Structure formats: C-alpha cells, structure tokens
C-alpha cells in the first residue's frame, strides 16, 4: 500500500533553522591545487547550503618569542575566498613548540598566541566576520591523539582557560566550546566530563574566578550505520548534560562529527551515490523532526556537522567519505587532478533551499502514521517574502533511505497531498529527483568501465550524471493544492518547490573565477549572494573570443566545468541567473583567462 505525504503549507508551525552546514577534515595538503578545487565545490553549494569547515590541526599551520602566520593566512584566504569558514579548533603545537600545558609558561605562551591570531584575522576580516567562527578545542581530548604534546586532565583545563582568556584578549564577542569528544558514561571521557565541572563549578587559571566561559558544548557521536542511532545517542548524553550541569541546560549542544560510521577512508559502496545522501537528509530531518520540532524534552540541540570534506585516494575515488571524488590523472603533461561532485554534495544544495520555517507535515501508511524513524520520511518549509526580489515558497523535501542499504528491485509509490498553498501571482511548482540509476557519476565510472585516468569525454559522461533530474516550471492548480504520484527508489530524494512570483528579477550573479584543470578544460565559480531569491532554474553561462551561449542542461550549482570539443577556453566569461518565469538577471563582471 502507497505512502501518504500530507503537507500544509498554511500551517507554519515553528522556526526551521539550517542547522547543518557544516563539513570538516582531517590533513594527514590544505593549500594543493586538490584542496583549493575541494573547498571551490564546498563553497560553491548554493544559498550557503555549506559555511562552516571544522579544520583539525590549524595550529600546525604556524611556526615559531614571535610566530608566522603565512600559512594559516593562506588556508584562511583560501576559505574566505570561498564565502566559508572555519571550524576553528585550537589544535596544534606551534611546530614543535608547546609540549606540557602543565608548565605555566606555556600555559601563559598559549594565550598569547591565541590573542595574537584572533587580533591578527579580526584585523585581516574584521570582527563581524570573525565573531561567528566556532573556536573550538583541541579534538578528541579523550582519544590521545596529542603527538609530543603532554595533555592531562588539569593540562586540558589549563589549556581551556588560556584559549578562553587568549580569545577574550581579542574580543569579548569571539565564541568558543568544546571538548568535542564523545562522553562515554565515566569512567569513562575524563577530560570531556572534567572540562564541563570546571566550566561549570571550577577556578580560571589566570582570574581566579569561580565558573569559566563556554559558549557551546561539542559533542561526536556516529551511527554504526544506524542513522536513528545518533539521535538516541544525543539525547542520552544531554539528558545527562543537563541534569548533572543545571547552569548548562540552555548551552547549545553541537554534534560536529554526525557521521553515520566511523572511519572516513574505509571504502563502502554506499558513500559513493545516493544511498549516502539520502541518509544525510533523514538524519537531519530526523533531527528537526524527532528532536527540534517542539517536543516535551526540548535540547538545545545548534549544529550537525558531516565529517567529509576530506579528499578521496586510489584505489577508491567515490567509495570513501568525501563530498567529491577525486581522479589524480598522472598521464598527461603535465599531471592534474579533477574532482566530481559526489550526489551527498548535490543533496547538501538540495537541503540549501529550505527556508526559515517548517510546515505541518505528515507520512502514513494505509492510516498508521509514520514518523521520520522509518525508510520515508519529509522535511517542508515556507519562506515569508522579505522584499520586491522574492516572494513565498515551500520547499518540500522527501527522501527515501534504508540506512546504508539499497534496494535497487525495489519502487516506493508515494503520494503527495499539498494544501493551503497561500493565493498569489504566477504560482509554479518545480521537481528535483536523484537517484543511482540517474544520478550517481559513480554509476556511469563503472559503465565507462573504471577507467583509472579518465579522458576528457569520460568526464563529461561522469559529470552528466552530477545534478538531479529536473522537471520545467509547471503553474500550480487552482486553490492552492498539488497532488504528485511519483515512484522513488530505495534510495533517493524528491525535492517539490513551489514559488510565487516575486515582483522584480534576479539580482547580479557576483565574484565569478576561473580556475585552470588542464589543456582546453576549466572550472567556473560564483556566488549567488546578491541573487536575492532560490526561484532558480538554471545559471546562463556567456564565452567571448570578440559573448554567446555554452548550452548545458539546467544546474543551479554555483560551479561549473566548462570542457568543450573544441579544446577552445581563452578569452572571458560572464554569468547571469534564470528563474521560474524564464526571467534574466543581470550579468556578472566580466572574467579573463588565457592558457
Ligand atoms: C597518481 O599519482 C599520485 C601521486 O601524485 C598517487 O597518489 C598516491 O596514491 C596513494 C594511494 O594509491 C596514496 O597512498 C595512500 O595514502 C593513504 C593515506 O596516507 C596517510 O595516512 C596514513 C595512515 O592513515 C599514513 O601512514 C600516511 O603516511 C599518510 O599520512 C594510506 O592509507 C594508503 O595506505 C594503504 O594503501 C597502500 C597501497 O596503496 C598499502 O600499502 C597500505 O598498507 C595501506 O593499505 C596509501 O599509502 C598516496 O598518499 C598518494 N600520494 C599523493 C602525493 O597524493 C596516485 O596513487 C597515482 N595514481 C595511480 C593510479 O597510480
Ligand atoms: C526507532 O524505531 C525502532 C524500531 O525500528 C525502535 O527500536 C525498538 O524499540 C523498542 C522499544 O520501544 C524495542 O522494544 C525494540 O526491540 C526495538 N526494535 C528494533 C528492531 O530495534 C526505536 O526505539 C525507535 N527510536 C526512536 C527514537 O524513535
Ligand atoms: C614564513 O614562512 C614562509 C613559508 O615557510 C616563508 O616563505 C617565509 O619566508 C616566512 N616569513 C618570515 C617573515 O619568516
Ligand atoms: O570517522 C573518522 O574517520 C574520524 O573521526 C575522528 O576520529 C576524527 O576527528 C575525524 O577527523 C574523522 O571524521
Ligand atoms: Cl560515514
């Protein structure tokens, strides 16, 4: 029997807050060509749909009483460049400089130099931008990964108080948290629990004051494969959270490692198409839905973050947990690297067009209602018109997902029942569909044949299958209702967007580069900052050799590979965005490049 989704898009219940937006890494490499083409993809999700980059060991990034920043500043560069920021953990030991956070000098040291970076990067961006990173501690206090660095319990707090004080030399407005580790029942995650008792109840290394500073505290916790498993684990720990720390009940709690498992590199076919994507988003509809949408407990649950900005390697370009796969291709002259975007990337674009509150919604199944713990599931949103460049739009975002199981023999009929669409002009309806037969570039790899090193053409083929299919612009039925029958496989993800017509056009496509992959192939990025509205069909690319159309299918991605038979890229380009009602905004500066 078919699966019922009801949406009521008069019924504006609550705020829905975009949560996720988060990605992180790992270097073993921060300022490659690979990692500038990576955090180009991650920057280019469209509307923000990724801002934050969670970046372990940045402090190694500075060497060494005065220091130098040049590398911290180009990775910094490089995500401001970008419209992201970072994850910013004080992790890192100077090269080779602190060693015992027990010796008061370091101790001492450590806010100095905490001071000195967050002056320095208030001073290059202003503190505006700088105020809304996320300083965190070092990772994992627990899991004694500190190198020749001696952190012990009372080190841990001493390094606390001198990250704290170091920030608060630069500004009272600069936010810091931690530990972002697990807390395990003690025990068990000393330094994680300890952390918290001296935040709460201890003593400020260079104050004296009882009660230090926390801002927001970080936790991981990861599935097992289980996605509801992550939820059952968040509560319990801010259960105890709060019944143990009654001065932390309303702390934001971050989950900054939301992975559904552990171990990044291992390779799993399903991290490679939609399976993975698919399980992306009913973790965080999971989390709205199940944890955020006003239940009796109510945590103060901030920030999930998927652990996968890391860079794929041989021999498993898709199969790993990353947001794009990368193909080094060592047999040209010279050799270069590409990157594809992995549809957990395009699904995190998918997730961007949410807007600031969550609709009534309901799935059933022959009557017994469904909530977002089984394999369907809906997350829908409603926009309140700001000015003359948008108008209202639901967003209305289904998925299908068995965890990290596919079922590929397998077809879900679904019907979507929206009502109360609230009356207005030129009112259209748009779908968005992925799944693996039609939108997994790694499906078509592996009908090219694997191909090691791919040709220019295999490129193509691969990136063909990068963006969902999208159905055009239909006007919506009279009185503000929608009825859709469409099938999902097991896995997938249905994407409905209904948008009135907003009284002006798009706004100026902005900061628009190119970047060079190789011979007669590049890539193009932007920014939609000024676009104004998420009523978009397609970006309309312009090439000049002294403008004319490179004709492509639809993409509201903010990047592009332009690859032409011709081998013919010199000269400049220029960007401008197509909404619903076929309406152009106006084209960005114009771009220059020669090979
Ligand atoms: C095209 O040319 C590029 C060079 O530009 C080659 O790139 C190398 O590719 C290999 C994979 O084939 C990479 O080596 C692998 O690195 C992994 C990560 O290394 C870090 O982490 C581990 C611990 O987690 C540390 O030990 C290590 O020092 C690093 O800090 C390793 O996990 C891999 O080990 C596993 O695979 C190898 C076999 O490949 C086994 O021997 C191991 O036992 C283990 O199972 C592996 O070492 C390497 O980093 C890449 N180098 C660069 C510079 O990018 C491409 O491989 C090449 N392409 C082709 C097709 O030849
Ligand atoms: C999510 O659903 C699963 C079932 O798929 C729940 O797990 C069951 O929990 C009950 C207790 O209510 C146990 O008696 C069963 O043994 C569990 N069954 C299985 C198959 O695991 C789980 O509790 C649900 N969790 C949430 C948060 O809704
Ligand atoms: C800082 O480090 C960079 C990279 O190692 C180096 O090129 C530069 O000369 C250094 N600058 C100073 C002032 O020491
Ligand atoms: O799951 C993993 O591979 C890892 O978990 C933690 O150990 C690390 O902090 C992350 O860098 C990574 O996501
Ligand atoms: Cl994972």
């Known amino acids: 029997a078919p699966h019922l989704v009801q949406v009521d898009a008069a019924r504006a219940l609550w705020p829905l807050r975009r949560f996720w937006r988060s990605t992180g890494f790992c270097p073993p490499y921060v300022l490659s060509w690979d990692q500038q083409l990576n955090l180009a993809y991650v920057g280019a999700v469209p509307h923000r749909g990724i801002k934050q980059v969670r970046t372990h060991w940045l402090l190694e990034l500075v060497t060494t009483l005065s220091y130098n920043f040049t590398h911290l500043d180009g990775y910094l560069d490089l995500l401001r460049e970008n419209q992201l920021l970072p994850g910013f953990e004080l992790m890192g030991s100077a090269s080779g400089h602190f060693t015992d956070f027990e010796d008061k000098q370091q101790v001492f040291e450590w806010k100095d130099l905490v001071s000195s970076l967050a002056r320095r990067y208030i001073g290059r961006y202003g503190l505006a931008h700088v105020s809304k990173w996320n300083f965190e501690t070092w990772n994992e206090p627990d899991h004694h990964d500190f190198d020749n660095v001696s952190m012990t319990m009372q080190g841990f707090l001493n390094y606390y108080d001198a990250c704290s004080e170091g920030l608060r030399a630069a500004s009272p407005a600069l936010r810091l948290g931690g530990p972002g580790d697990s807390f395990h029942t003690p025990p068990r995650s000393p330094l994680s629990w300890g952390l918290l008792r001296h935040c709460h109840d201890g003593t400020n290394f260079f104050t004296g004051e009882a009660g230090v500073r926390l801002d927001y505290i970080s936790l991981h916790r990861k599935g097992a494969r289980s996605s509801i498993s992550i939820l059952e684990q968040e509560k319990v720990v801010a259960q105890q959270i709060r019944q143990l720390f009654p001065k932390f009940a309303d702390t934001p709690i971050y989950n900054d490692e939301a992975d559904p498992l552990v171990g990044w590199s291992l390779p799993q ?162 779908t968005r569909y992925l799944d693996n037969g039609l939108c997994s570039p790694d499906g078509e790899w592996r009908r090219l044949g694997r191909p090691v090193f791919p040709t220019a053409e295999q490129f193509r083929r691969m990136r063909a299958a990068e963006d969902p299919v999208a159905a055009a612009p239909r006007p919506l039925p009279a009185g503000g209702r929608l009825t859709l029958r469409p099938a999902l496989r097991l896995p997938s993800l249905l994407l409905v967007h209904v948008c009135a017509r907003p009284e002006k056009p798009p706004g100026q496509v902005t900061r628009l580069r190119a970047l060079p992959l190789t011979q007669g192939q590049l890539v193009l990025v932007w920014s939609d900052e000024h676009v104004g509205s998420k009523c978009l069909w397609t970006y309309e690319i312009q090439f000049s050799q002294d403008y004319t159309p490179v004709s492509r299918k639809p993409s509201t991605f903010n990047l592009f590979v332009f690859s032409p038979d011709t081998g013919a890229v010199s000269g400049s380009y220029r960007v401008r965005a197509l909404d619903y009602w076929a309406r152009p905004g106006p084209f960005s500066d114009p771009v220059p490049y020669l090979e």
Not at 343 to 351: D, K, R
Not at 356 to 381: F, I, K, P
Not at 403 to 428: I, K, Y
Request: aromatic share 8%; hydrophobic share 45%; glycine share 4%.
């Open 269 to 430: 076919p399903w991290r490679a198409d939609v399976t993975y994507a698919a399980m992306v988003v009913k973790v965080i509809a999971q989390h709205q839905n199940l944890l955020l949408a006003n239940t009796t407990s109510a945590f103060p649950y901030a920030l999930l973050s998927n652990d996968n900005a890391f860079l794929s390697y041989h021999p498993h370009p898709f199969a790993q947990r990353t947001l794009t796969a990368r193909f080094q291709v060592n047999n040209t002259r010279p050799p270069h690297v590409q990157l594809l975007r992995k549809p957990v990337l395009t699904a995190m674009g998918l997730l961007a067009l949410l807007d600031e509150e969550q609709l009534w919604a309901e799935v059933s199944q022959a009557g017994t209602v469904l909530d977002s713990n089984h394999t369907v599931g809906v997350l829908a949103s409603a926009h309140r018109p700001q000015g003359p460049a948008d108008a209202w739009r639901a967003a209305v975002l289904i998925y299908a997902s068995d965890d990290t199981r596919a079922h590929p023999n397998r077809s879900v009929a679904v019907t979507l029942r929206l009502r109360g669409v609230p009356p207005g002009p030129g009112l259209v309806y748009v």
